[PDB]
């Protein structure tokens, strides 16, 4: 049976008890921790492709208040969809299966430049989800992945001190 599995979830939940915060920039900025999932029960003779993107997970924006995160007014129009491929892809089940998947290249901006990078209004909760794409399935059969210990809120600047150090201190 088909399971996606998240690495290194003990250094996610560090930064989610803390409120997780990713810097988005005018040229894109990678993230830490990265997305990182070790996959089994896929077909190892049949192709797939990983795909990534970012749900929003509140109808409200947020602000940092008194060193606390709280509602910080009405959302921003939500921003366009972007999916990132991952560049392994298309590839086989054994290819995905052997050792963990990882997302490194991406980026997250504020800015639709181009560049395959994901578009994020900063003050905003966002939670990763990753799909799995089968190469020439006339059903077109697609799997979702959300991993809530992976929230984050998308920063210009980093707001919390003790994420700044933490991200130091981890990376
Ligand atoms: N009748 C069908 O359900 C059917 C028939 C042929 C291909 C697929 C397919 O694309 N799958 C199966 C499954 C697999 O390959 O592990 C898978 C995992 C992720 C994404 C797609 C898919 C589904």
Same mark, same amino acid.
């Given at each position: 049976?088909?399971?996606?599995?998240?690495?290194?979830?003990?250094?996610?939940?560090?930064?989610?008890?803390?409120?997780?915060?990713?810097? !988005?920039?005018?040229?894109?900025? @990678?993230?830490?921790? +990265?997305?990182?999932?070790? &996959?089994? /029960?896929?077909? %190892?003779?049949?192709?797939?492709?990983?795909?990534?993107?970012? !749900?929003?997970?509140?109808?409200? @924006?947020?602000?940092? +208040?008194?060193?606390?995160? &709280?509602? /910080?007014?009405? %959302?921003?129009?939500?921003?366009?969809?972007?999916?990132?491929?991952?560049?392994?892809?298309?590839?086989?089940?054994?290819?995905?299966?052997?050792?963990? &998947?990882?997302?490194?290249?991406?980026?997250?901006?504020?800015?639709?430049?181009?560049?395959?990078?994901?578009?994020?209004?900063?003050?905003?909760?966002?939670?990763?989800?990753?799909?799995?794409?089968?190469?020439?399935?006339?059903?077109?059969?697609?799997?979702?992945?959300?991993?809530?210990?992976?929230?984050?809120?998308?920063?210009?600047?980093?707001?919390?001190?003790?994420?700044?150090?933490?991200?130091?201190?981890?990376?």
């Amino acid at each position: 049976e088909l399971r996606v599995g998240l690495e290194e979830s003990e250094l996610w939940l560090r930064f989610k008890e803390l409120t997780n915060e990713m810097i !988005v920039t005018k040229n894109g900025r @990678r993230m830490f921790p +990265v997305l990182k999932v070790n &996959v089994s /029960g896929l077909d %190892p003779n049949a192709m797939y492709s990983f795909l990534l993107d970012f !749900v929003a997970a509140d109808n409200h @924006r947020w602000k940092y +208040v008194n060193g606390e995160w &709280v509602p /910080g007014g009405k %959302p921003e129009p939500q921003a366009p969809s972007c999916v990132y491929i991952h560049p392994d892809s298309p590839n086989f089940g054994a290819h995905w299966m052997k050792a963990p &998947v990882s997302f490194s290249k991406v980026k997250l901006t504020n800015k639709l430049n181009g560049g395959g990078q994901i578009m994020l209004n900063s003050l905003h909760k966002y939670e990763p989800r990753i799909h799995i794409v089968r190469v020439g399935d006339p059903q077109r059969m697609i799997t979702s992945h959300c991993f809530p210990e992976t929230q984050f809120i998308a920063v210009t600047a980093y707001q919390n001190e003790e994420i700044t150090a933490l991200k130091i201190k981890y990376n």
